Design a protein around this ligand. Structure first.
Ligand SMILES: [Cl-]
Ligand SMILES: [Cl-]
Lengths: 594, 600
């Protein structure tokens, strides 16, 4: 279990917080001489770099956009003098992909994983009342011992080029907000809630972790601040009579309030009373079935790359609502915590995905996810280091996101090898670990490439429901062969039906690249009309199987990828353009999903 | 003299700040009932709204995008206990266009002007160690008594529709960051610096304004932190030996430090970075640090996909990397003061700025870009609304100058863009604006504005007031375009020959010239709207500029495609950008890069 708290920062009497967002100093370190040359003390010749954002798309030259290797940030903040006697942490929403944090010259901690928060305890070096310095050494290379997976090519000048095993640009930097926070010396470290429904009434079971021994009181407030339940102890049950349940696209948020007393700490968070259970082939939310309708997405916008902005969230949610979606998948990595906060208010359902993408050794991975070629990926001697990373990223993800009502499943892989017992052994461990970290035991899943065929795949028995990525009519029998493609699709769904697994299937990826404004009569692959015809055919197949309980189309919006001959300025399978405007097919979803 | 400080917020022991950026609560008020119905105490049915951002582009239906009238924002912040016995202010970078601030139920203050900071003293109503509430009524209508000017149509169902007299979309709301801050009870309110060059040495003349009577000392620190000058007094001269001047695209910044002292103690401390440099017009020449400068760059807009005018540092970083690749040294803040961060960063990068008050649309026309050369006068400055418009024009000027005057990057004030000037009612109007501006600026730096074609040499009455003359011309586009471009050139030269013959002996800058250019539209031979036509229009206008000794700058229109109100002459905004709205370059962007690499 973890040496820090994953809880979002708040500001009350006992807990303080100050934003470090703004313009930082930035400098590339291509010869990797920073540590030995005093950069922990300040950067020798930096530039200005916005935070949060991704560094790549600001520059005007290739070597800098495509930089791969070591690079540094530095900034300076004044701590209020009133934060003596408090524990003081730096909280980075993310450090992509790995980094060591230095503060006032001292190395505080290093982290691996570029999509989950990083906590640095600077209590012993922070100078309250004075100006303080923070310096972060970051690395954005890809390998097969960390997620997401890939490789690093050295070119003739010795400069490094990222060669990912995934299909999305390797944005990196400090992409999410950065805080400095003050906690009490005895503090709430973690807590977990589970829900039971008793007719109209409800139980909120909870457990609490603290950095101390003092008694804990837990209060639960309704939307208007009035009290509805109170229990003493670090373990308890809250009784909410005539409970107001969090519903799909109709949220109700209670407020939990955790206290440590003699009052030493207070933590407050919005939660939603709802239950998630798989009965047979159905997904039950509050004991009634739900059908998932929505999109795979990316944290991706012009200029900012993966940088968080609230304006992107607002628009992306006003578009999801306009299509009448109810659900999205945080593909292929946990998002910024603000996305889940807002999903909670709006009643969207989230499949939360750990970044286990790239577990097949292929640099053009999307044509290759149906080629039939096994890459011997889980037979290699780096696999134990990889497994340790994957489990640690699952643990940090679940701890961070488990108390959001919108999060209803965990996706623990996208398009890996599953056709050999080497991969069963691997994934069995991962699921085992995820089952222990989630106090609610909500459904665990992953998304399968076409190569994980019903006859050969070893891993679908680990899944509570099964997610399929399928491109019938695009990478398989596309264009004039599109009727062959429908058959082949039905052929496979027939074989899955024949297995009588009695579990739900969700299509988590299907789509066509579509250039906005390419019209052709008759339609051709890449036009707007072909996208509509494609979707109308996948819909017919989905609607032919009682156990298909969900469609998450790929993608919500055009996004940026590694450049290559099959990628025309990124990936054009969006239903919206990258500036968040709808292609002709968005209307297809809107109508179907009403 | 203003009842508050325009000084950007800092965080030291004496001064603390807290950001309120985030999701605020938002609610439209089409019936205009919020105050009588208690919205000052919280909104009844809100939705969430990013701050900073313009609200318009988030929504999916026209009624909300095109909303005009009253609308309300609300949030809640915790004030640390330790801020008892401090003066506590809310500081909005901007409230667009007018608004009334409420804090814990109480009307604190009102403000008119959508593009400069709003300061609201909440010291008597703030509750430290408790959670506090802010609520703002905003109105984004346009009128003829405030800037920028327009009108307001009432549709048949009672809906208000904005009808601006300007060519940009009427984005509005809380478009810039918002802070709550704590100041000392005796604080630095204001300061001003002027400079004189003394060979290897330099003088920094200054003056400080405080809110009490304890004494001031002023320190000056070089770039590396070391003390290079010190002076007691609220008015002084700092003596910098072996000064590092601030130079175009080669910036050096000192830190100035202003203390209010209680003998051996410190009451207040303010620090800003500044840059020693001098600006002077000598004849037809624009002298920076005693050498001539040719202005090369762009008129810009605070504009970006989804965010509207919302401020983001990444828009800044990208926009400056593009300006550097272009080899520009200049830009004008058309047509309103920008977020302060823009100027802070121009100081680090050494760009020259022309700072523009929002005095645009002073001529009644709703399709006003076909009408800046039409020849039709609209009696704009004889209306009885004009004395009110003058007062808020001066008020915005004083507020812009007080805010921006200490940036090295700011070399001149633009006080109008394309107004009617062919009339003595207009001379009498602008004599007052300029007289006002002269007083608020401690550096008496150059004042100008930008003239439409309508303001001909023989008819214009306002160019005498200008230390240099900015022209917006579109010969080869709105006038005599496409096949007739040969004629557009002779017409252009004929106008310039008349300016020449006046022998005014002042510098002329071209602040607008451009062609709508659709990215990707290629024609051989070229046609108006093709990328090829943009390049040729430009090569033509450069030949004209270069024929006149007194032309000393060229700011092309626009850096980037930007959003306007819609209509038949506007294909999803304005397409005179040299870059796209997503900040990639059309073919005429290298025309600039090459010309400007090889100028000075
Ligand atoms: Cl290059
Ligand atoms: Cl509509």
């Amino acid at each position: 279990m973890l040496e820090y708290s994953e809880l979002y920062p708040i500001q009350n009497g006992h807990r303080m917080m100050q934003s470090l967002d703004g313009m930082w100093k930035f400098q590339f370190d291509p010869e990797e001489i920073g540590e030995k040359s005093g950069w922990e003390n300040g950067l020798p010749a930096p530039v200005s770099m916005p935070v949060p954002s991704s560094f790549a798309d600001f520059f005007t030259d290739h070597k800098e956009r495509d930089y791969c290797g070591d690079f540094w940030y530095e900034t300076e903040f004044y701590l209020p003098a009133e934060w003596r006697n408090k524990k003081i942490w730096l909280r980075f929403g993310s450090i992509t992909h790995r980094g060591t944090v230095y503060c006032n010259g001292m190395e505080i901690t290093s982290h691996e994983g570029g999509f989950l928060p990083v906590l640095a305890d600077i209590s012993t070096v922070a100078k309250p009342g004075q100006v303080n310095q923070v310096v972060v050494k970051i690395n954005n290379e890809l390998n097969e011992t960390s997620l997401p997976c890939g490789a690093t090519k050295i070119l003739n000048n010795g400069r490094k080029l990222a060669k990912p095993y995934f299909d999305f640009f390797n944005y990196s930097g400090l992409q999410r907000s950065v805080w400095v926070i003050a906690l009490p010396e005895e503090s709430v470290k973690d807590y977990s809630v589970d829900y039971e429904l008793c007719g109209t009434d409800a139980l909120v079971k909870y457990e609490v972790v603290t950095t101390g021994e003092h008694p804990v009181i837990v209060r639960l407030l309704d939307a208007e601040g009035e009290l509805v339940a109170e229990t003493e102890g670090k373990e308890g049950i809250l009784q909410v009579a005539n409970a107001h349940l969090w519903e799909v696209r109709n949220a109700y948020l209670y407020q939990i309030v955790i206290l440590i007393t003699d009052v030493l700490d207070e933590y407050r968070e919005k939660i939603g009373i709802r239950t998630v259970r798989i009965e047979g082939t159905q997904i039950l939310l509050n004991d009634r079935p739900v059908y998932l309708k929505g999109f795979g997405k990316h944290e991706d916008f012009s200029i900012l790359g993966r940088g968080f902005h609230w304006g992107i969230v607002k628009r992306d949610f006003e578009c999801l609502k306009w299509t009448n979606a109810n659900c999205f998948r945080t593909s292929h990595y946990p998002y910024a915590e603000e996305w889940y906060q807002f999903a909670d208010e709006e009643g969207f359902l989230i499949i939360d995905e750990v970044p286990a993408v790239g577990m097949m050794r292929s640099t053009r991975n999307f044509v290759a996810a149906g080629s039939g070629n096994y890459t011997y990926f889980f037979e290699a001697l780096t696999v134990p280091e990889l497994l340790k990373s994957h489990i640690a990223d699952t643990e940090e993800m679940i701890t961070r996101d488990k108390n959001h009502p919108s999060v209803i499943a965990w996706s623990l892989f996208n398009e890996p090898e599953t056709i050999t017992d080497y991969a069963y052994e691997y994934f069995k461990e991962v699921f085992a670990a995820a089952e222990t970290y989630d106090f609610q035991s909500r459904p665990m899943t992953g998304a399968f490439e076409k190569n994980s065929k019903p006859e050969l795949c070893k891993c679908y028995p680990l899944c509570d429901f099964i997610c399929l990525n399928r491109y019938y009519g695009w990478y398989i029998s596309g264009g004039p062969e599109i009727e062959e493609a429908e058959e082949l699709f039905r052929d496979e769904m027939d074989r899955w039906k024949a297995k009588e697994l009695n579990v739900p299937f969700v299509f988590t990826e299907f789509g066509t690249d579509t250039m906005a404004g390419l019209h052709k009569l008759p339609s051709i692959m890449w036009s707007e009309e072909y996208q509509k015809e494609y979707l109308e055919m996948n819909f017919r197949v989905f609607d032919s199987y009682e156990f298909v309980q969900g469609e998450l189309a790929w993608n919500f919006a055009d996004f940026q990828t590694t450049e290559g001959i099959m990628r025309v300025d990124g990936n054009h399978k969006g239903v919206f353009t990258r500036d968040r405007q709808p292609k002709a097919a968005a209307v297809v979803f809107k109508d179907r999903w009403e």
